[PDB]
């Protein structure tokens, strides 16, 4: 119903201009963990009314990697501030 349009409008918390930009890179890793619960909820509304009885273990497992994923990504974001003190995505040295 309208309970899916909101929330499919709320999947646009990626929006890629604000998925790596601008600086204070913690603001970009924020919406990477906040892009979940637009997948954790959008799955949970579908498994639950339509009684699948078995696929509802999948929303439990959906958090378990994305927590461990983002925790890894947060380890490296200390290493960019361990060498500097500021994350500041307009750091660029290795050209392309």
Partner 1 sequence: NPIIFIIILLTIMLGTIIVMISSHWLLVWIGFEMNMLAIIPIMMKNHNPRATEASTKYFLTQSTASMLLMMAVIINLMFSGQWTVMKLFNPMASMLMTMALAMKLGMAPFHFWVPEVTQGIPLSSGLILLTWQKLAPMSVLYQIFPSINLNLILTLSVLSILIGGWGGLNQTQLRKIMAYSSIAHMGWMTAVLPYNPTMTLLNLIIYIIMTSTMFTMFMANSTTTTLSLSHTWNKTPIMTVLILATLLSMGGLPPLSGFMPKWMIIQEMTKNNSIILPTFMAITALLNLYFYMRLTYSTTLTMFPSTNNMKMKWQFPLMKKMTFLPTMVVLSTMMLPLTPMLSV
Partner 2 sequence: PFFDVQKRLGVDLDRWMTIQSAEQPHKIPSRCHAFEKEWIECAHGIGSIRAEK
Name the site residues for partner 2 (rule: CB under 8 A): 49-55, 57-58
Question: What is the rounded distance in angstroms from the CA atom of residue 34 to the CA atom of residue 13?
Answer: 7
Strands (E), the chain: none
Residues 77 and 52: their CA atoms lie apart, in Å, by 40
Tell me which of partner 1, partner 2, none is bound by residue 90, counting a contact when its beta carbon lies within the kind-specific cut-off of 5 to 8 angstroms. none
Decide whether 12 or 46 has the Cβ nearer to partner 2: 46
Judged by beta carbon distances under 5 to 8 A according to partner kind, the member of partner 2, partner 1, none in contact with residue 54 is partner 2
Q: Are 73 and 32 in contact (CB under 8 A)?
A: yes
What does the alpha-carbon distance between residue 81 and residue 84 come to, in Å, rounded to a whole number? 5
| SS3 (DSSP) at 60 | helix
Is 2 or 95 the residue whose CB approaches partner 1 more closely? 95
Binding site residues, partner 1, CB under 8 A: 11, 14, 16, 19-20, 28-29, 32, 35, 39, 42-43, 46, 50, 52, 58, 61-62, 65, 68-69, 72-73, 76-77, 79-80, 83, 91, 93-96
């Amino acid at each position: 119903s309208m309970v899916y349009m909101n929330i499919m409008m709320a999947f646009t918390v990626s929006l890629v201009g604000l998925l790596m930009y601008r600086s204070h890179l913690m603001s970009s890793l924020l919406c990477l963990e906040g892009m979940m619960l637009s997948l954790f909820v959008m799955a949970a509304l579908t498994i639950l009314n339509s009684h699948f009885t078995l696929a509802s273990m999948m929303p439990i497992i959906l958090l378990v990697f994305a927590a461990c994923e983002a925790a890894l990504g947060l380890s490296l974001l200390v290493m960019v501030s361990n060498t500097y003190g500021t994350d500041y995505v307009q750091n660029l040295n290795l050209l392309q």
